[PDB]
Enzyme design. Structure first.
Site, PDB file in Angstrom:
ATOM      1  N   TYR B  54       0.857  -1.187   0.000  1.00 58.91           N
ATOM      2  CA  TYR B  54       0.000   0.000   0.000  1.00 58.91           C
ATOM      3  C   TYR B  54       0.899   1.245   0.000  1.00 58.91           C
ATOM      4  O   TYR B  54       1.647   1.428   0.914  1.00 58.91           O
ATOM      5  CB  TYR B  54      -0.877   0.025   1.261  1.00 58.91           C
ATOM      6  CG  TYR B  54      -2.347   0.047   0.968  1.00 58.91           C
ATOM      7  CD1 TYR B  54      -2.948   1.149   0.352  1.00 58.91           C
ATOM      8  CD2 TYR B  54      -3.147  -1.063   1.254  1.00 58.91           C
ATOM      9  CE1 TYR B  54      -4.290   1.139   0.034  1.00 58.91           C
ATOM     10  CE2 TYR B  54      -4.494  -1.066   0.953  1.00 58.91           C
ATOM     11  CZ  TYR B  54      -5.060   0.026   0.340  1.00 58.91           C
ATOM     12  OH  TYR B  54      -6.402  -0.011   0.029  1.00 58.91           O
ATOM     13  N   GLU B  56      -0.195   4.795  -0.706  1.00 61.48           N
ATOM     14  CA  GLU B  56      -0.915   6.041  -0.888  1.00 61.48           C
ATOM     15  C   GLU B  56      -0.005   7.252  -0.844  1.00 61.48           C
ATOM     16  O   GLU B  56       0.796   7.386   0.052  1.00 61.48           O
ATOM     17  CB  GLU B  56      -1.995   6.163   0.162  1.00 61.48           C
ATOM     18  CG  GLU B  56      -3.278   5.457  -0.263  1.00 61.48           C
ATOM     19  CD  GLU B  56      -4.134   5.061   0.895  1.00 61.48           C
ATOM     20  OE1 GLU B  56      -3.647   4.253   1.683  1.00 61.48           O
ATOM     21  OE2 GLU B  56      -5.261   5.576   1.037  1.00 61.48           O
ATOM     22  N   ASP B 208      -5.977  12.944 -26.197  1.00 61.06           N
ATOM     23  CA  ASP B 208      -6.033  11.545 -25.747  1.00 61.06           C
ATOM     24  C   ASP B 208      -5.449  10.699 -26.869  1.00 61.06           C
ATOM     25  O   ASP B 208      -6.111  10.496 -27.890  1.00 61.06           O
ATOM     26  CB  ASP B 208      -7.477  11.120 -25.439  1.00 61.06           C
ATOM     27  CG  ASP B 208      -7.572   9.707 -24.826  1.00 61.06           C
ATOM     28  OD1 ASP B 208      -6.597   8.936 -24.875  1.00 61.06           O
ATOM     29  OD2 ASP B 208      -8.633   9.368 -24.279  1.00 61.06           O
ATOM     30  N   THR B 234      -3.455   5.359 -22.653  1.00 61.29           N
ATOM     31  CA  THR B 234      -3.447   4.035 -22.044  1.00 61.29           C
ATOM     32  C   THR B 234      -2.182   3.373 -22.474  1.00 61.29           C
ATOM     33  O   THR B 234      -1.579   3.807 -23.450  1.00 61.29           O
ATOM     34  CB  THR B 234      -4.631   3.186 -22.520  1.00 61.29           C
ATOM     35  OG1 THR B 234      -4.696   3.181 -23.952  1.00 61.29           O
ATOM     36  CG2 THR B 234      -5.919   3.723 -21.939  1.00 61.29           C
ATOM     37  N   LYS B 237      -2.725  -0.756 -25.463  1.00 60.25           N
ATOM     38  CA  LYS B 237      -3.073  -0.877 -26.860  1.00 60.25           C
ATOM     39  C   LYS B 237      -1.808  -0.976 -27.726  1.00 60.25           C
ATOM     40  O   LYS B 237      -1.012  -1.928 -27.564  1.00 60.25           O
ATOM     41  CB  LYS B 237      -3.949   0.280 -27.253  1.00 60.25           C
ATOM     42  CG  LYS B 237      -5.163   0.466 -26.385  1.00 60.25           C
ATOM     43  CD  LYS B 237      -5.972   1.659 -26.884  1.00 60.25           C
ATOM     44  CE  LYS B 237      -7.328   1.713 -26.217  1.00 60.25           C
ATOM     45  NZ  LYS B 237      -7.305   2.252 -24.843  1.00 60.25           N
ATOM     46  N   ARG B 243      -2.607  -3.080 -18.710  1.00 60.26           N
ATOM     47  CA  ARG B 243      -3.776  -2.235 -18.661  1.00 60.26           C
ATOM     48  C   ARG B 243      -3.571  -1.160 -17.580  1.00 60.26           C
ATOM     49  O   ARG B 243      -3.614  -1.433 -16.394  1.00 60.26           O
ATOM     50  CB  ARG B 243      -5.029  -3.046 -18.402  1.00 60.26           C
ATOM     51  CG  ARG B 243      -5.154  -4.263 -19.293  1.00 60.26           C
ATOM     52  CD  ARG B 243      -6.530  -4.904 -19.168  1.00 60.26           C
ATOM     53  NE  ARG B 243      -7.529  -4.174 -19.934  1.00 60.26           N
ATOM     54  CZ  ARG B 243      -7.707  -4.271 -21.243  1.00 60.26           C
ATOM     55  NH1 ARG B 243      -6.996  -5.094 -21.990  1.00 60.26           N
ATOM     56  NH2 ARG B 243      -8.644  -3.547 -21.812  1.00 60.26           N
TER      57      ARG B 243
HETATM   58  C1  LIG Z   1      -3.876   7.223   3.768  1.00 55.93           C
HETATM   59  C2  LIG Z   1      -5.305   6.900   4.120  1.00 55.93           C
HETATM   60  N1  LIG Z   1      -6.209   6.467   3.225  1.00 55.93           N
HETATM   61  N2  LIG Z   1      -7.497   6.276   3.745  1.00 55.93           N
HETATM   62  C3  LIG Z   1      -7.365   6.585   5.032  1.00 55.93           C
HETATM   63  C4  LIG Z   1      -6.025   7.014   5.418  1.00 55.93           C
HETATM   64  C5  LIG Z   1      -5.656   7.422   6.815  1.00 55.93           C
HETATM   65  C6  LIG Z   1      -5.076   8.825   6.811  1.00 55.93           C
HETATM   66  C7  LIG Z   1      -5.359   9.755   5.800  1.00 55.93           C
HETATM   67  C8  LIG Z   1      -4.804  11.036   5.833  1.00 55.93           C
HETATM   68  C9  LIG Z   1      -5.085  12.047   4.777  1.00 55.93           C
HETATM   69  C10 LIG Z   1      -5.437  13.339   5.143  1.00 55.93           C
HETATM   70  C11 LIG Z   1      -5.673  14.286   4.153  1.00 55.93           C
HETATM   71  C12 LIG Z   1      -5.587  13.943   2.811  1.00 55.93           C
HETATM   72  C13 LIG Z   1      -5.240  12.651   2.456  1.00 55.93           C
HETATM   73  C14 LIG Z   1      -4.979  11.709   3.438  1.00 55.93           C
HETATM   74  F1  LIG Z   1      -4.645  10.446   3.091  1.00 55.93           F
HETATM   75  C15 LIG Z   1      -3.980  11.414   6.876  1.00 55.93           C
HETATM   76  C16 LIG Z   1      -3.681  10.527   7.889  1.00 55.93           C
HETATM   77  C17 LIG Z   1      -2.759  10.973   9.005  1.00 55.93           C
HETATM   78  F2  LIG Z   1      -3.374  11.831   9.758  1.00 55.93           F
HETATM   79  F3  LIG Z   1      -2.410   9.981   9.806  1.00 55.93           F
HETATM   80  F4  LIG Z   1      -1.718  11.624   8.493  1.00 55.93           F
HETATM   81  C18 LIG Z   1      -4.221   9.248   7.847  1.00 55.93           C
HETATM   82  C19 LIG Z   1      -4.690   6.375   7.386  1.00 55.93           C
HETATM   83  C20 LIG Z   1      -5.261   4.941   7.377  1.00 55.93           C
HETATM   84  C21 LIG Z   1      -3.299   6.376   6.730  1.00 55.93           C
HETATM   85  C22 LIG Z   1      -6.878   7.392   7.726  1.00 55.93           C
HETATM   86  C23 LIG Z   1      -6.653   7.751   8.905  1.00 55.93           C
HETATM   87  N3  LIG Z   1      -6.436   8.089  10.009  1.00 55.93           N
HETATM   88  C24 LIG Z   1      -8.098   6.965   7.327  1.00 55.93           C
HETATM   89  N4  LIG Z   1      -9.143   6.929   8.141  1.00 55.93           N
HETATM   90  O1  LIG Z   1      -8.349   6.534   5.972  1.00 55.93           O
HETATM   91  C1  LIG Z   2      -9.113   7.367 -26.736  1.00 62.95           C
HETATM   92  C2  LIG Z   2      -9.451   6.356 -25.668  1.00 62.95           C
HETATM   93  N1  LIG Z   2      -9.419   6.713 -24.354  1.00 62.95           N
HETATM   94  C3  LIG Z   2      -9.714   5.868 -23.347  1.00 62.95           C
HETATM   95  C4  LIG Z   2     -10.069   4.530 -23.584  1.00 62.95           C
HETATM   96  C5  LIG Z   2     -10.429   3.695 -22.389  1.00 62.95           C
HETATM   97  O1  LIG Z   2      -9.409   3.085 -21.640  1.00 62.95           O
HETATM   98  P1  LIG Z   2      -9.932   2.006 -20.571  1.00 62.95           P
HETATM   99  O2  LIG Z   2     -10.780   1.032 -21.353  1.00 62.95           O
HETATM  100  O3  LIG Z   2      -8.600   1.387 -20.153  1.00 62.95           O
HETATM  101  O4  LIG Z   2     -10.697   2.749 -19.533  1.00 62.95           O
HETATM  102  C6  LIG Z   2     -10.191   4.003 -24.971  1.00 62.95           C
HETATM  103  C7  LIG Z   2     -10.582   2.559 -25.326  1.00 62.95           C
HETATM  104  N2  LIG Z   2     -11.613   2.423 -26.329  1.00 62.95           N
HETATM  105  C8  LIG Z   2     -12.133   1.099 -26.627  1.00 62.95           C
HETATM  106  C9  LIG Z   2     -11.438   0.543 -27.840  1.00 62.95           C
HETATM  107  O5  LIG Z   2     -10.859   1.324 -28.605  1.00 62.95           O
HETATM  108  O6  LIG Z   2     -11.446  -0.677 -28.036  1.00 62.95           O
HETATM  109  C10 LIG Z   2      -9.853   4.967 -26.030  1.00 62.95           C
HETATM  110  O7  LIG Z   2      -9.903   4.559 -27.299  1.00 62.95           O
HETATM  111  C1  LIG Z   3     -13.186   1.051   4.125  1.00 59.70           C
HETATM  112  C2  LIG Z   3     -12.315   1.280   2.906  1.00 59.70           C
HETATM  113  N1  LIG Z   3     -12.857   1.476   1.688  1.00 59.70           N
HETATM  114  C3  LIG Z   3     -12.178   1.705   0.550  1.00 59.70           C
HETATM  115  C4  LIG Z   3     -10.791   1.764   0.521  1.00 59.70           C
HETATM  116  C5  LIG Z   3     -10.128   2.049  -0.809  1.00 59.70           C
HETATM  117  O1  LIG Z   3      -9.381   0.965  -1.343  1.00 59.70           O
HETATM  118  P1  LIG Z   3      -8.409   1.308  -2.572  1.00 59.70           P
HETATM  119  O2  LIG Z   3      -7.166   1.797  -1.855  1.00 59.70           O
HETATM  120  O3  LIG Z   3      -8.254  -0.080  -3.202  1.00 59.70           O
HETATM  121  O4  LIG Z   3      -9.005   2.351  -3.441  1.00 59.70           O
HETATM  122  C6  LIG Z   3     -10.036   1.570   1.782  1.00 59.70           C
HETATM  123  C7  LIG Z   3      -8.511   1.622   1.816  1.00 59.70           C
HETATM  124  N2  LIG Z   3      -7.938   1.903   3.119  1.00 59.70           N
HETATM  125  C8  LIG Z   3      -6.518   2.182   3.257  1.00 59.70           C
HETATM  126  C9  LIG Z   3      -5.985   1.412   4.451  1.00 59.70           C
HETATM  127  O5  LIG Z   3      -6.782   0.989   5.290  1.00 59.70           O
HETATM  128  O6  LIG Z   3      -4.786   1.214   4.591  1.00 59.70           O
HETATM  129  C10 LIG Z   3     -10.840   1.324   3.004  1.00 59.70           C
HETATM  130  O7  LIG Z   3     -10.255   1.162   4.210  1.00 59.70           O
END
Ligand SMILES: Cc1[nH]nc2c1[C@](c1cc(-c3ccccc3F)cc(C(F)(F)F)c1)(C(C)C)C(C#N)=C(N)O2
Ligand SMILES: Cc1ncc(COP(=O)(O)O)c(CNCC(=O)O)c1O
Ligand SMILES: Cc1ncc(COP(=O)(O)O)c(CNCC(=O)O)c1O
Ligand SMILES: Cc1[nH]nc2c1[C@](c1cc(-c3ccccc3F)cc(C(F)(F)F)c1)(C(C)C)C(C#N)=C(N)O2
Ligand SMILES: [Cl-]
Lengths: 442, 442
Positions: B54, B56, B208, B234, B237, B243
């Site tokens: 992870y 972020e 694009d 992308t 292609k 992807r």
């Molecule tokens: C990176 C992430 N992704 N989704 C999240 C976080 C956390 C988090 C997020 C942020 C954060 C704040 C502003 C903008 C973007 C950010 F990612 C700051 C902190 C912190 F305070 F610890 F620095 C923690 C943590 C699990 C890492 C977080 C928590 N707590 C919660 N709940 O969800």
């Molecule tokens: C100009 C352009 N932009 C974005 C995408 C979409 O990318 P994702 O599918 O990865 O989201 C396509 C694919 N167009 C479908 C095709 O040409 O077969 C595209 O042709």
């Molecule tokens: C409840 C919840 N929902 C959605 C997401 C988003 O997943 P993607 O990062 O795959 O977009 C997280 C990720 N949480 C970050 C962490 O707990 O470390 C989550 O904790």
């Protein structure tokens, strides 16, 4: 007219770093609550040629032909998902196309409420996710607070969700959706009470169970399928799948919801699906529905309870004083060290954790906690006995962190200077690497 | 506490379908203009343990630690990308986090204009993408027409972008962004003229180039980096990557665009990056910047020209009467068959192509063309000589399609009834399978 040389011959520069990455993972005590380690079979799917295929649309409703084998994999995945989460395909639908958790929650939210729609979610600082409507005075940090109108509910001073505050907000705010299930919440959720509140305001019930998904599937924790209109989860955390997401919808409760959700994933937000993801997800969902995986999930909870109890024996405070799940949040205020400082210290000893806010915190700069979890280490074979050592290592890092802060001061820039070469850290890392390096590694 | 059995032992049900999929890919004449075949090296990256992590945030600005090796991979990717597209890292920046093309476009669009923001793009029916603002009378089909305010510009009756119409529209509509670069456009783009229109109205220029990325990188076609504020592409292609998608921004033209774009990808839309994707992209970006890959790209164009020419020798009409790139769109009106009927016919003979709109077409239902492309077959080693045979195969499929429509009628349900067991098709398929099966397969 292509190069078939292996990764090592083709790009030695890249292959070294990956091997470096591999060594660091296997030599680290990984307490990131959201991380896990995938098996070889899931990694075989992710490397599969199925990713070559463009299959925009849905099974039997593809834009292109040649999707016969792709359609079987997408249908096999949806069946296994509904089975794993103990739901009937007549009553529940699921979408397997979302690329990640954040995409899936945004797609699902849009389907339910649309642009300018009103949503309620838990605040990031109290344990909510970014995709639950998070914003700041300075900026609408998440798209979920910008393309939607969002209200955020804080947990109480002891770190529990305060339902009275939620209902107070729902009646005044009158949202179309209320989100529960969180990113750093150490306790179980009362979905029934959420369903009661949503009804009073006529709002949808959205449960995001990515952190606890395994618990819900194996019936060790409360079941949101009983009360929720939509359930979302990622597959890469406690579930132990690839990086992907799943969106569940209650057809019985809301007929015509299937179309809204399916159309939201495509073509509203995404284009082509990632077939390697889907194949990999299918593969893990079969493992999920086995008595062995339930065992593993049970093990994750046992390890988490043991870890909490050991930390408390060493006089470490936990938010809500313990856990009902895979994760713990340590309140570090009594030691007067920040979470960023301890995270820095822990990196030096090859311990992976993350700084985390606590109820008292008013800022995402200088959070007073760290969040840990047991799923990665449980995957690596650690049992209850192994948790005293993890707790001991964390206690030693807290003391070291206090010592360094005493020596160089509270400013983060000054504190970091103390870190390189520190005898105790080099020693602590050494014990960490020796124990971590031994454990089974998929 | 995991199952390390191989995919075949662990999930025989899934593994058979994948081998099935593999065999169909190897036995198909793949003319999907957006498809390609990745090498083993790119698939090794996709199966790599790097996806366990992870991360972020961005390099050196990660929320979590333990990202030293992940940071090297992300920086190595952005470096390799900028090199490949012949831009100075001082003048241009690139984001490597977007999971797919559609995500990348929505993210980039949001960065530039925000919610309710005004955008202009080519209509879906004319060769534009869904992410370029596509909507219909019945619904706002793309989020890009719903979260943004969009106006759509059509190509002329000969299939060319009509700039007079674009200017007429921009001055009247006054958008903040104008998008060019298309999904099914067989000719090159005048970026300069677009840059001129944007300046007249003070709108951003967005190119694009996903379909033509290789042509831009190896300089066979016009360079939008000379004129555009943003370039998106992308990697799956013509580029032959996994992807994923790339977002490019011109820092010199718009300082402070770097932050706007980067914040839009995270944390506005996405959460954690998919490191296996990033690793895979880096690996292909090295190949892109080799004189050998330019040769392959050159070969894709040679094959495309030869194919157009052979189709024309057989009395088949092409939109714009030829091509400047990897793709062709066939106008089927003189034969009184629709694209859907030919696509069905082509799936029966293991020829992969897709139905496509033509300028004459009013509605997306019943489009009058098919779109073909040479990148996949060029990847399989097909040379200019091999195109007459592909053109021959398509000519036979059109004839058979006309005969079947004569026999069973124009209704799609009725037409398909004629398809199974047809002697000519079994023959054509076998001929197709024998030639396709023989070609090199990565
Ligand atoms: C990176 C992430 N992704 N989704 C999240 C976080 C956390 C988090 C997020 C942020 C954060 C704040 C502003 C903008 C973007 C950010 F990612 C700051 C902190 C912190 F305070 F610890 F620095 C923690 C943590 C699990 C890492 C977080 C928590 N707590 C919660 N709940 O969800
Ligand atoms: C100009 C352009 N932009 C974005 C995408 C979409 O990318 P994702 O599918 O990865 O989201 C396509 C694919 N167009 C479908 C095709 O040409 O077969 C595209 O042709
Ligand atoms: C409840 C919840 N929902 C959605 C997401 C988003 O997943 P993607 O990062 O795959 O977009 C997280 C990720 N949480 C970050 C962490 O707990 O470390 C989550 O904790
Ligand atoms: C699947 C896809 N993705 N991005 C696209 C398409 C195309 C397309 C899209 C659609 C379409 C219409 C409404 C809603 C969703 C859709 F996908 C219909 C047709 C058609 F003509 F064949 F029916 C073609 C084509 C390359 C497959 C298309 C074209 N032409 C264009 N320009 O861009
Ligand atoms: Cl992937």
């Amino acid at each position: 007219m292509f190069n078939n040389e292996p990764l090592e011959q083709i790009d030695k520069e890249l292959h070294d770093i990956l091997a470096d990455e591999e060594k660091r993972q296997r030599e680290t005590i990984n307490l990131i609550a959201s991380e896990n380690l995938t098996n070889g079979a899931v990694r075989e799917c992710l490397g599969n040629r199925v990713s070559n295929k463009y299959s925009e649309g849905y099974p039997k409703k593809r834009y292109y032909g040649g999707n016969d084998f792709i359609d079987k994999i997408e249908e096999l995945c949806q069946k296994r998902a509904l089975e794993a989460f103990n739901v009937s395909d007549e009553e529940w639908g699921v979408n397997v196309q979302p690329l990640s958790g954040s995409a899936a929650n945004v797609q699902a939210l849009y389907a339910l409420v649309g642009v300018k729609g009103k949503i309620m979610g838990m605040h990031l600082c109290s344990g909510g996710h970014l995709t639950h409507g998070f914003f700041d005075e300075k900026k609408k940090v998440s798209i979920t607070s910008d393309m939607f109108e969002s209200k955020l509910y804080k947990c109480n001073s002891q770190g529990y969700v305060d339902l009275d505050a939620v209902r107070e907000m729902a009646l005044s705010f009158k949202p179309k959706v209320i989100i529960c299930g969180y990113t750093s919440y150490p306790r179980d959720i009362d979905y029934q009470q959420f369903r009661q509140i949503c009804d009073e305001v006529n709002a949808y019930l959205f449960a995001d169970i990515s952190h606890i998904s395994s618990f819900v599937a194996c019936n060790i924790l409360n079941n949101p399928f009983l009360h929720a209109d939509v359930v979302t989860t990622t597959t890469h955390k406690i579930l132990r799948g690839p990086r992907s997401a799943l969106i569940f919808f209650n057809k019985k409760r809301n007929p015509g919801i299937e179309q809204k959700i399916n159309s939201a994933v495509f073509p509203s937000f995404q284009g082509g699906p990632h077939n390697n993801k889907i194949a990999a997800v299918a593969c893990q969902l079969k493992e999920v529905h086995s008595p062995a995986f339930k065992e593993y999930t049970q093990q994750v909870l046992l390890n988490s309870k043991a870890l909490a109890k050991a930390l408390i024996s060493k006089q470490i405070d936990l938010v809500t004083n313990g856990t009902d799940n895979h994760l713990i949040v340590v309140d570090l205020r009594k030691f007067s060290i920040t979470g960023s400082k301890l995270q820095e210290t822990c990196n030096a000893i090859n311990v992976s954790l993350n700084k985390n806010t606590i109820p008292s915190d008013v800022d995402c700069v200088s959070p007073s906690g760290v969040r840990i979890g047991t799923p990665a280490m449980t995957t690596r074979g650690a049992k209850e006995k192994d948790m005293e050592f993890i707790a001991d290592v964390l206690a030693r890092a807290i003391k070291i962190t206090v010592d360094l802060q005493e020596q160089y001061g509270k400013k983060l820039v000054d504190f970091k200077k103390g870190l390189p070469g520190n005898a105790q850290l080099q020693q602590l890392k050494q014990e960490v690497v020796t124990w971590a390096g031994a454990l089974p590694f998929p």
